[PDB]
Design a protein around this ligand. Structure first.
Ligand SMILES: [Mg+2]
Length: 280
């Protein structure tokens, strides 16, 4: 089991050697286009960049870059787009992606301000009456409804393509309670939040991939996907004890760098899969 592989790592006090192992074994691939000098200001971080093979392109002749990777999990029949938190210049690109990738849910795992700095642009409308328009990508975004809770908030949003007059219902699943520092004491709210996303159909293949982000789109986002996928694979396989988290993490890392930024988040992911495994 991992229940008992986990308890071994605690007692041996060896979490950061495990996590460092994952780092060394991890895939490295080129990020040529992320690093073109014209996409400088499309990136929040000089050291978080999408691999070329797995990057999302914008359908437009001008410049097709966005900092977003498609994580494709063959066996679990799950796909995700991990991306950075929209910058003020990239909110339109962000909704273009949502539009073009035919996504149903956006999963956001940061507050707009954390530790006193801005971690993300306010990329969505706060009031029904005051809708956003992205002139660069000819999109309208309207807040239809909003349902706020202890550990998370959900929003019904309407996304109109102004070029073509078609509109679409996007679901905004905001996890609002990840602490500024470290990780949650228990993984129970986070799992709860994951199930709520699941319940919406936003992860299901009737739709294009969910778009998941924190500020960089690798830390908390990684945990979300890794926990979701590991549990699905636990549901599917003849032998559930066979799912290796380290193996699944390294697979996910073939598609985006950096997934799980700390040994804490790793412990936490293990943890959330084990606790999540008892709702089963
Ligand atoms: Mg009002």
């Amino acid at each position: 089991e991992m229940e008992k592989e986990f308890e071994q790592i605690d007692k041996s006090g060896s979490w950061a050697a495990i996590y460092q192992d994952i780092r060394h074994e991890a895939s490295d691939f080129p990020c040529r286009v992320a690093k073109l000098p014209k996409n400088k200001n499309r990136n929040r971080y000089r050291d978080v960049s999408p691999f070329d093979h797995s990057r999302i392109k914008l359908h437009q002749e001008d410049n097709d870059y966005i900092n977003a990777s498609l994580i494709k999990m063959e066996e679990a029949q799950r796909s995700y787009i991990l991306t950075q938190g929209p910058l003020p210049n990239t909110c339109g690109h962000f909704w273009e992606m949502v539009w073009e990738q035919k996504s149903r849910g956006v999963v956001m795992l940061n507050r707009v301000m954390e530790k006193g700095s801005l971690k993300c642009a306010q990329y969505w409308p706060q009031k029904e009456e005051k809708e956003m328009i992205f002139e660069d990508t000819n999109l309208k975004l309207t807040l239809i409804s909003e349902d706020i809770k202890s550990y998370y908030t959900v929003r019904q949003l309407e996304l109109e393509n102004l070029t073509t007059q078609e509109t679409r219902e996007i679901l905004h699943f905001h996890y609002t309670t990840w602490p500024d520092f470290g990780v949650p004491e228990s993984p129970a709210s986070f799992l709860n939040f994951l199930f709520k996303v699941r319940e919406s159909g936003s992860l299901s293949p009737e739709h294009g991939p969910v778009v998941v982000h924190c500020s960089a789109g690798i830390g908390r986002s990684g945990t979300f996907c890794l926990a979701d996928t590991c549990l699905l694979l636990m549901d599917k396989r003849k032998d559930p004890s066979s799912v290796d988290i380290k193996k699944v993490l390294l697979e996910m890392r073939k598609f985006r760098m950096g997934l799980i930024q700390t040994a804490d988040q790793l412990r936490f992911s293990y943890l959330a899969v084990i606790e999540g495994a008892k709702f089963i």
